[PDB]
Amino acid sequence: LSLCGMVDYHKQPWQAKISVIGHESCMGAVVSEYFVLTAAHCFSIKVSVGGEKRDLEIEVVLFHPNYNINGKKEAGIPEFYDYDVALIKLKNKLKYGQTIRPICLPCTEGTTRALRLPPTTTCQQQKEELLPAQDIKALFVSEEEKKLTRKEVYIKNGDKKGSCERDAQYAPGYDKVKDISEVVTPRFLCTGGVSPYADPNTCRGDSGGPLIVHKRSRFIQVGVISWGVVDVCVPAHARDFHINLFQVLPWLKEKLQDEDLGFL
Numbered sequence: 113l114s115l116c117g118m119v120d121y122h123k124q125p126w127q128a129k130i131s132v133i134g135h136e137s138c139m140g141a142v143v144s145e146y147f148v149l150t151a152a153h154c155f156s157i158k159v160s161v162g163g164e165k166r167d168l169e170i171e172v173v174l175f176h177p178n179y180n181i182n183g184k185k186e187a188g189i190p191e192f193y194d195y196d197v198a199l200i201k202l203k204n205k206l207k208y209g210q211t212i213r214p215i216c217l218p219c220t221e222g223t224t225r226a227l228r229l230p231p232t233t234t235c236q237q238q239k240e241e242l243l244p245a246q247d248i249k250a251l252f253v254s255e256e257e258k259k260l261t262r263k264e265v266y267i268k269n270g271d272k273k274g275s276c277e278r279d280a281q282y283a284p285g286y287d288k289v290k291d292i293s294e295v296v297t298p299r300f301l302c303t304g305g306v307s308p309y310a311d312p313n314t315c316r317g318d319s320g321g322p323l324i325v326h327k328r329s330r331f332i333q334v335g336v337i338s339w340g341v342v343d344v345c346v347p348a349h350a351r352d353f354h355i356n357l358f359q360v361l362p363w364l365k366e367k368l369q370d371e372d373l374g375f376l
């Protein structure tokens with residue numbers, strides 16, 4: 113079992129850069145020797161790790177079976193980001209080192225050990241530790257002038273969760289949605305806004321990158337960056353929505369079953 117979430121690419125050795133050819137940009141995270149986790153909506157395909165120039169040979173890209181960006185077009189919702197996760201399977205085994213390391217995923221033995229929790233630890237116990245009912249200090253990784261940079265955000269998972277979710281009404285094409293639960297599903301975590309702190313916002317190029325909790329000197333991926341309310345790249349309603357990886361575990365467990373991650 114790899115030591116996951118342990119340390120520019122020196123400081124974010126899990127980070128992957130994705131280009132799709134006028135170039136669309138996304139990010140992802142190394143989660144095993146053969147897999148990069150990213151957003152489904154990011155999808156000729158160029159993936160790089162370790163700040164390398166080299167583009168890695170792709171075997172297949174696997175998509176969450178419930179993902180359908182067009183799924184609510186008939187209801188007048190232009191883009192529906194539910195289950196916005198994909199796994200890039202690499203042809204060649206990644207060589208872990210100073211520049212290339214896997215991030216921890218929820219409800220794995222890797223995360224149990226990173227959090228110094230006992231062997232009886234459940235998936236629910238990991239969720240209570242990482243995503244308590246409060247404002248949760250987190251980070252994401254962006255690019256500025258070809259250098260990777262950390263940005264600190266707060267996940268609104270307590271008394272501010274409703275306020276964060278309701279700001280979805282300001283996103284492009286969502287202004288006529290009666291029931292915000294139609295676009296903000298139970299798959300989403302919410303960051304951004306000015307309470308409790310003035311959170312920075314994701315850029316479109318940051319989509320697919322990990323939303324990370326930094327705990328006990330370790331980095332645990334809790335989310336995949338999915339969509340924003342405002343393209344800032346700032347109103348108090350500028351929120352960002354992330355796929356909660358605790359909510360896509362059956363799919364992660366099935367696709368990564370042979371990756372020696374020790375899913376619970």
Ligand SMILES: Cc1cc(Br)c(NC2=NCCN2)c2ccccc12
Binds near residue numbers: 314315316319339
């Ligand atoms: C950063 C960002 C801003 C805005 Br505005 C978007 N548009 C939009 N969000 C919900 C419906 N359409 C984005 C969409 C995807 C990814 C990032 C986005």
